[PDB]
Symmetry: C2
Amino acid sequence: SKRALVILAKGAEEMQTVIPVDVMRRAGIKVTVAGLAGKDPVQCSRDVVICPDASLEDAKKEGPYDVVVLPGGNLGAQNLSESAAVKEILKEQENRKGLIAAICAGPTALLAHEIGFGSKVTTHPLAKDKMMNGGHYTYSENRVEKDGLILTSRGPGTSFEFALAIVEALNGKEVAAQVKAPLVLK
Amino acid sequence: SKRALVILAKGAEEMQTVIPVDVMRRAGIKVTVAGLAGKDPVQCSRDVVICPDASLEDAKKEGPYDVVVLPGGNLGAQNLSESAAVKEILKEQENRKGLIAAICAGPTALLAHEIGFGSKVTTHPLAKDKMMNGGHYTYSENRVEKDGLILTSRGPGTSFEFALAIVEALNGKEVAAQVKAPLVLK
């Protein structure tokens, strides 16, 4: 019913890509893993190679999505931050008041594309200074932060909590709890 | 320095594949993701498609490994359990007293191949009855269990703890702690 776009760039943190994709699919969300650079396999930060479902070029024409998800990894987030296609997608999503979810270094692409200024956000500790350049967000050390349509989180180890927050926002608390139980979370 | 073989079968739980691969690479372990059925892309349980580094046929000739890792997912574990190549690898590993690490339904392939009988093990709760058929193991509800060379764990949400246990066994506690810190674990 609900639809998610996960934008996959070279150098993405593969845990932060796969955990949300998997958890959202467990929730019955229709997820498109879209390759930033095309439909070719993407080499992630720790050398896991993932085959996208679609190119971003194609996926962005099949909008709109109920959530747009930006994985982290510094190098993946730098690619997201440099992309005109990402900018357009995120601007459209913000303008239609749809959810934008970003983890680790991922939120730094929000800064690059001027998305969600004034929001409370978290990032990976090592991405804080980049995110806070110019003081356009208020920083949080919460494991997951949500300020309206801007949902952010910190790292590989917050990925389940991030994904479940997306599920809760889209499909509600009951679905999130049902999905969570078989995961054997702490 | 240390080397890990991760055996990737169709229907594997992709979180349980990627979290250990990534965490072990963070630890400086040399990891080979080996496709059970060949070097072709593998469709995992929640439709993430991963490109293996090597076929299992090729990787098994480049042994031996300091750990052999079996991801879970019921359907992936059933494929592992049905494979003669997996049997031979695990028998060799047991005979050379090398580490064998399995998560979720993964440990059920140990039962199939008669590996490590008499050990204390955990599995996913839904795989317990399968693992315990014949009473050849003693069951534990610990999130990670280790009995000599047999290291087991429960589910997606225990994957970080599982991977870090592998790192501790191979490279020691200090390396595991160093790797853990930037993950932002609970």
